[PDB]
Design a protein around this nucleic acid. Sequence first.
RNA 1: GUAGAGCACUGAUAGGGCUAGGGGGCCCACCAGCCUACCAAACCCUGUCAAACUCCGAAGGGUCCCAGGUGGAGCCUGGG
RNA 2: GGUCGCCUCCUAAAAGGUAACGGAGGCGCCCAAAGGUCCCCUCAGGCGGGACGGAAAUCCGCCGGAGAGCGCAAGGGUAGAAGGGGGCCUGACUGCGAGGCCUGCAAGCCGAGCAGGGGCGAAAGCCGGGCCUAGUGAACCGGUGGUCCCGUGUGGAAGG
RNA 3: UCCCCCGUGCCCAUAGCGGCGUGGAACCACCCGUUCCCAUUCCGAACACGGAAGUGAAACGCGCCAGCGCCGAUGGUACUGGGCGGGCGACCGCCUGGGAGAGUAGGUCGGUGCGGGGGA
RNA 4: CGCGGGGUGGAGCAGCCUGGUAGCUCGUCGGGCUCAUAACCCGAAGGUCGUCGGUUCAAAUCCGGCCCCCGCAACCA
RNA 5: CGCGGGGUGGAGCAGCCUGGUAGCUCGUCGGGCUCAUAACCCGAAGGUCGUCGGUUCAAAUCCGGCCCCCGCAACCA
Lengths: 110, 53, 181, 84, 141
Amino acid sequence: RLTAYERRKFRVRNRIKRTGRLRLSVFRSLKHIYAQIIDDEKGVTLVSASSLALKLKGNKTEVARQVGRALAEKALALGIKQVAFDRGPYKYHGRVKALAEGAREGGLEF
Amino acid sequence: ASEVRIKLLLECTECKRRNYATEKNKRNTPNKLELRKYCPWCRKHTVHREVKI
Amino acid sequence: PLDLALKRKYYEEVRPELIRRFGYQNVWEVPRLEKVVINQGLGEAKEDARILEKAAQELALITGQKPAVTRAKKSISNFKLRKGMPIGLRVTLRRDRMWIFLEKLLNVALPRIRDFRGLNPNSFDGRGNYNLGLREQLIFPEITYDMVDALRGMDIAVVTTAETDEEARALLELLGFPFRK
Amino acid sequence: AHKKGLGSTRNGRDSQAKRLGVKRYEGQVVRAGNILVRQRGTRFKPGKNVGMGRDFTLFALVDGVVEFQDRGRLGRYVHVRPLA
Amino acid sequence: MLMPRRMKYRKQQRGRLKGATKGGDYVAFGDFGLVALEPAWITAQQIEAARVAMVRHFRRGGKIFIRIFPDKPYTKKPLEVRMGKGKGNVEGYVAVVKPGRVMFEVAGVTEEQAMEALRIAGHKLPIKTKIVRRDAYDEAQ
RNA sequence: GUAGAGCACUGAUAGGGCUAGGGGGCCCACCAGCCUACCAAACCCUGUCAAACUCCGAAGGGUCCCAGGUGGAGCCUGGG
RNA sequence: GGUCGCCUCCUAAAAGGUAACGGAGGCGCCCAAAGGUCCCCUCAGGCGGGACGGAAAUCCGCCGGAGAGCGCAAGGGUAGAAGGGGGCCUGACUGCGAGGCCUGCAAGCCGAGCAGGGGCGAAAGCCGGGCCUAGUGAACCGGUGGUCCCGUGUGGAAGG
RNA sequence: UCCCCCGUGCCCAUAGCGGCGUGGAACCACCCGUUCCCAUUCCGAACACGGAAGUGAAACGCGCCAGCGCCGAUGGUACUGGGCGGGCGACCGCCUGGGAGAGUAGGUCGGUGCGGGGGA
RNA sequence: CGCGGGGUGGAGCAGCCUGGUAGCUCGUCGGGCUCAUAACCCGAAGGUCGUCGGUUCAAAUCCGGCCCCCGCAACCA
RNA sequence: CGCGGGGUGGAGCAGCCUGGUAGCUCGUCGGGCUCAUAACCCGAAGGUCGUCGGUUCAAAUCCGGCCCCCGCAACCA
Ligand SMILES: CN(CC[C@H](N)CC(=O)N[C@H]1C=C[C@H](n2ccc(N)nc2=O)O[C@@H]1C(=O)O)C(=N)N
Ligand SMILES: [Mg+2]
Ligand SMILES: [Mg+2]
Ligand SMILES: [Mg+2]
Ligand SMILES: [Mg+2]
Ligand SMILES: [Mg+2]
Ligand SMILES: [Mg+2]
Ligand SMILES: [Mg+2]
Ligand SMILES: [Mg+2]
Ligand SMILES: [Mg+2]
Ligand SMILES: [Mg+2]
Ligand SMILES: [Mg+2]
Ligand SMILES: [Mg+2]
Ligand SMILES: [Mg+2]
Ligand SMILES: [Mg+2]
Ligand SMILES: [Mg+2]
Ligand SMILES: [Mg+2]
Ligand SMILES: [Mg+2]
Ligand SMILES: [Mg+2]
Ligand SMILES: [Mg+2]
Ligand SMILES: [Mg+2]
Ligand SMILES: [Mg+2]
Ligand SMILES: [Mg+2]
Ligand SMILES: [Mg+2]
Ligand SMILES: [Mg+2]
Ligand SMILES: [Mg+2]
Ligand SMILES: [Mg+2]
Ligand SMILES: [Mg+2]
Ligand SMILES: [Mg+2]
Ligand SMILES: [Mg+2]
Ligand SMILES: [Mg+2]
Ligand SMILES: [Mg+2]
Ligand SMILES: [Mg+2]
Ligand SMILES: [Mg+2]
Ligand SMILES: [Mg+2]
Ligand SMILES: [Mg+2]
Ligand SMILES: [Mg+2]
Ligand SMILES: [Mg+2]
Ligand SMILES: [Mg+2]
Ligand SMILES: [Mg+2]
Ligand SMILES: [Mg+2]
Ligand SMILES: [Mg+2]
Ligand SMILES: [Mg+2]
Ligand SMILES: [Mg+2]
Ligand SMILES: [Mg+2]
Ligand SMILES: [Mg+2]
Ligand SMILES: [Mg+2]
Ligand SMILES: [Mg+2]
Ligand SMILES: [Mg+2]
Ligand SMILES: [Mg+2]
Ligand SMILES: [Mg+2]
Ligand SMILES: [Mg+2]
Ligand SMILES: [Mg+2]
Ligand SMILES: [Mg+2]
Ligand SMILES: [Mg+2]
Ligand SMILES: [Mg+2]
Ligand SMILES: [Mg+2]
Ligand SMILES: [Mg+2]
Ligand SMILES: [Mg+2]
Ligand SMILES: [Mg+2]
Ligand SMILES: [Mg+2]
Ligand SMILES: [Mg+2]
Ligand SMILES: [Mg+2]
Ligand SMILES: [Mg+2]
Ligand SMILES: [Mg+2]
Ligand SMILES: [Mg+2]
Ligand SMILES: [Mg+2]
Ligand SMILES: [Mg+2]
Ligand SMILES: [Mg+2]
Ligand SMILES: [Mg+2]
Ligand SMILES: [Mg+2]
Ligand SMILES: [Zn+2]
């Protein structure tokens, strides 16, 4: 048996893992918010901005905004551009949402 | 496809000339099958409506 | 959101007499009320009564929430019913509309039922929590003879963290519920 | 001297041949477009560079050998692995 | 008579009878037993005549175990018809026995009272038969 | 997905266990208690059957790659 | 007497294919929602639980991987949806088609990708009708709407 | 490089069902609230958001057992590509190569790659 | 498909070429009578007059035709 | 067995086509009139629809196996 959460993961995840593009796997915690970049074809992570590593604070969605700006620069150094946003079981609204448009601030294409 | 299910062609209400080919049940929707579609003689989408085939 | 007379009743009076019996080794293992799902469960609104609304707005002005129309699981012959036909009135009183409702049942509405005589105590399921059925509706404080039109009993379901049937007994019994024996 | 009240069979009907099944095999060169498997419902699953048609047909998207993979409970897959 | 009390399909194919049985080649309920030496189909007609035979042997007493069931439709074309025009209508019901399969067992019966018993029931059968008693080889099986 | 083989599903199936309602006294129920050398659902253990059953599954057979193979071999285009 | 085209299954001997007046069934339709998308969700059933209320109306509980559902026959497939609900919608597009599946012919069938112009989506992407496999009819003769290509010396017209 | 943790891939249930335990400083979760964005055929259950008082009860995590499910040999056999003989037949035997299904002995309460965040 | 006509009370139809009344027997209730099933007889419920949109001063008789039954006709690769 | 039609209150018939929809006659039981019986007048009672599967939400109705009534055949050259 699987959870609404568990199904909804695969449902949108698989929609994307079969696009060939670098998948940017997010994670929404009630504490703070992070996201890595995975080339699932192998399985390796390309780069991994966060909020525990960057140890920031001051409103969840504004520190959701920031972490992406980290991702943008810190990934674009490794010539990364092909971006496919794994939005997880979470939607595209507020928290995870801001991370995206923040990841867009840098030059990341998605 | 039957008595009940009539055939119909889609008129372009910009020039009144025919355009497409499909069916529609004339029971549950006795109205006019009005749908946006494309035109080669216009190269733009427009309005379309059932003219009796 | 708020703070009321039964919500604090469950607070400083009920939590202790519960750690009395079962002596819970943790703050949370202790019982507490979660869901309260009222069910007029009509079917009296078959392929006819569009006036199922003037019976379900009464359900609103006695539960505070609009009730959601539960339809047909499938189509049924002898019941005179098609898959899709409205046959249910489910309102799930959750959080602080629950205490606002539950007290008004116990202190005002429960007694005004005709020939009250406890509460059927075997009706506890076992694997968890509890629920039991009505007879009418105007016994509820919000209405009387002219406001209520047709008569309509209703089902009412408690959903508590009562893992066990015994500890459920205590939770509700202490909370204000009169039982048969 | 012969026949009498001879029972007629209600059946004797039949379908066409569908000539389904697997058309290309592992370690077989293919080009882009080729059909790898005809089927009715993914007995075989669309791998990398393998697409799926409106009847569950499975066709190659790029060149180089086909390759079969069996992921147990997940499904049987076939992908094409590009040239060299 | 031993007919299937419900049926998935009407007529059913012939199928050859190559080789030994698939199970029940070792006694499992009764003390003694009757077995196939040669493969056949057995009619419900036959089976019932063997049962009735034994049943009449130890008149009043004994318990009979019978380990085969007529589950196959023995179809047959009516009298004087030519080939084709469909398959025969189902005329009987038969059960597929191969060599080794156990057919008749008995318990609550003397030694020879089950010898003579399972002897005659052998005679109401289209096939050569052996009678064998329950043994450790059966217990180990 | 075949021979085999196995009931895990689809159906058959013999017995026994256990158990609905039916059957039937005890009661004579206005109803409960029902007891069962009765019928027997699901359900269990033993024991089985199946082209249109499949938890399984050969020998093989297909098909590609690579190697032997010069054969009244193979291939392309045409006449009969 | 029965049959005649189509689809499913079996016969069919584990590739494809294979007959019989072999064994069993269906098709000659349907859907402006049953479609496209995006978001979301999860069965049958069984046990306990409860006014009317039931073996089965609806509400509550614990057990359920799939035995439900997927318009309708069957097989395969299938909840990590193909199934249930909602919002916007009309790609049930026009111009094509690398490459193949099948195949005596002719038909049948899959389709990446390119161009125009739109749909939904934040976007990655998805849409050239429906979970697929039936729902069908070659060519001739003519009808209707267009285009404005021929038009019997010639401009038109007639006809094509 | 060793360990715990989080986010994840992969073998395909030896992974799982269940019962027994332990983990909160960290990280994860429940938990606090409806003001804001967002949100329910009713309900902040869920999705959302602002939080950090409580906690490890639930879930999840690491683990323990083998009751279930699961995987599961060796040996022998059925069957069979090929080559022979045998019976009126239904069918049976030998050679050579291949060789199961059940069942038996036993195994199993997972195994790991990438990055990150702690421990030394 | 194209020419012909209407689709009237619950079941039939005269209103109708020339608009004016929200129409008559059968059927149905109650009633005098009958010995009765009956004819007779006095009162009755029934039109959104197929609909939609009109023509006016309103329409059910005059129209655009929606509609889809009866009628005739001709064609069918 | 081959085709065709049939099976519904006690008797005989509708009802199936287009499913949810059980009517006509007789008779039968209760009551009236009558000295009484019929007649006639007033009321009511009475079929899970051959039989079984099954389709559907659901079957007199649709479908298929079997039992039965009836109708033509089973050509024997
Ligand atoms: C009775 N006749 C005879 C016609 C022929 N020329 C002669 C004759 O006897 N023909 C017959 C020949 C045999 C034929 N028959 C019978 C049985 C059968 N199974 N197959 C046949 O062909 O049926 C025919 C028949 O009687 O008409 C005429 N009225 N003409
Ligand atoms: Mg205690
Ligand atoms: Mg009382
Ligand atoms: Mg002769
Ligand atoms: Mg076939
Ligand atoms: Mg039995
Ligand atoms: Mg039994
Ligand atoms: Mg018995
Ligand atoms: Mg008992
Ligand atoms: Mg088989
Ligand atoms: Mg195995
Ligand atoms: Mg093997
Ligand atoms: Mg040569
Ligand atoms: Mg040439
Ligand atoms: Mg040449
Ligand atoms: Mg040439
Ligand atoms: Mg003929
Ligand atoms: Mg081929
Ligand atoms: Mg042929
Ligand atoms: Mg049960
Ligand atoms: Mg119950
Ligand atoms: Mg109840
Ligand atoms: Mg009850
Ligand atoms: Mg119930
Ligand atoms: Mg279906
Ligand atoms: Mg099959
Ligand atoms: Mg199946
Ligand atoms: Mg959906
Ligand atoms: Mg919907
Ligand atoms: Mg939007
Ligand atoms: Mg092509
Ligand atoms: Mg081509
Ligand atoms: Mg494309
Ligand atoms: Mg686009
Ligand atoms: Mg289809
Ligand atoms: Mg013209
Ligand atoms: Mg010109
Ligand atoms: Mg001029
Ligand atoms: Mg022209
Ligand atoms: Mg993870
Ligand atoms: Mg604990
Ligand atoms: Mg603390
Ligand atoms: Mg605990
Ligand atoms: Mg767990
Ligand atoms: Mg660890
Ligand atoms: Mg570890
Ligand atoms: Mg360790
Ligand atoms: Mg370990
Ligand atoms: Mg141990
Ligand atoms: Mg062990
Ligand atoms: Mg052990
Ligand atoms: Mg094993
Ligand atoms: Mg040979
Ligand atoms: Mg031989
Ligand atoms: Mg071996
Ligand atoms: Mg051998
Ligand atoms: Mg470290
Ligand atoms: Mg340090
Ligand atoms: Mg006329
Ligand atoms: Mg006038
Ligand atoms: Mg008188
Ligand atoms: Mg004529
Ligand atoms: Mg015509
Ligand atoms: Mg008939
Ligand atoms: Mg009769
Ligand atoms: Mg009549
Ligand atoms: Mg019939
Ligand atoms: Mg009826
Ligand atoms: Mg009278
Ligand atoms: Mg019938
Ligand atoms: Mg005759
Ligand atoms: Zn145009």
